[model samples]
Target: MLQLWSKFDVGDWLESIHLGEHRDRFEDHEIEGAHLPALTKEDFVELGVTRVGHRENIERALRQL
Candidate 1:
């Protein structure tokens, strides 16, 4: 039931989840035009996101779509 919010932006989401501190690292993730809702925890890990809590927050937001 996950939907890609039309206004969704990884940068915006990061800030929403209070992960804005890592915004510099995540800015290059190329999330734009990417299949957002299809993104999994493994994908974020592959991108070097070591924070389990942040990953969970992103996933939670995705599901809320």
Candidate 2:
């Protein structure tokens, strides 16, 4: 399950999920595992992940957390 990687650094987990490009934005927000469950679609939008598919992918990953 994706949650298997919760112990990973957020940036690294993003990479594992093939969304590494936004690592800097997430890091800028200091997002950690504790923040994952609370993140909303708007959060991904604000992170510049404007693509629908990418946002879906992120949301999917987050749900597994």
Candidate 3:
């Protein structure tokens, strides 16, 4: 199970996982669902993320489930 920290860019990790589409590449392991700490607009900005883009990326990653 990969637990992403608030500072981590989940989209980047998801992209890597997507690239390794074959089970052999990813070990056929499922990603466990987990909640992240709530972040405010300032938090997103501090993290260098646009809110809209962050939401979109999260949505796209969830679809991989």
Assess each prediction's global lDDT (C-alpha) against the native.
0.63, 0.78, 0.41
For residues 1-65, could you state the per-residue lDDT of candidate 3 as single tens digits?
A: 33542223343454564522222322222222243224345544444445576545545565654
Which TM-score value belongs to model 2?
A: 0.77
Where does candidate 3 clash, by residue pair?
Answer: none
Model 1 has how many clashing residue pairs?
0
lDDT of 2 by residue, 1-65 (tens): 43333434888988989999988888887777677767778887888788999988877877676
CA deviation > 4 Å runs, candidate 3 = 4-37, 59-65
Task: For model 3, state the Cα shift of residue 48 in Å.
Answer: 0.7
Error of 1 at 36 (Å): 2.1
Best by TM-score: 2
Stretches of candidate 1 above 4 Å error?
1-8
Full-model lDDT, candidate 1: 0.63
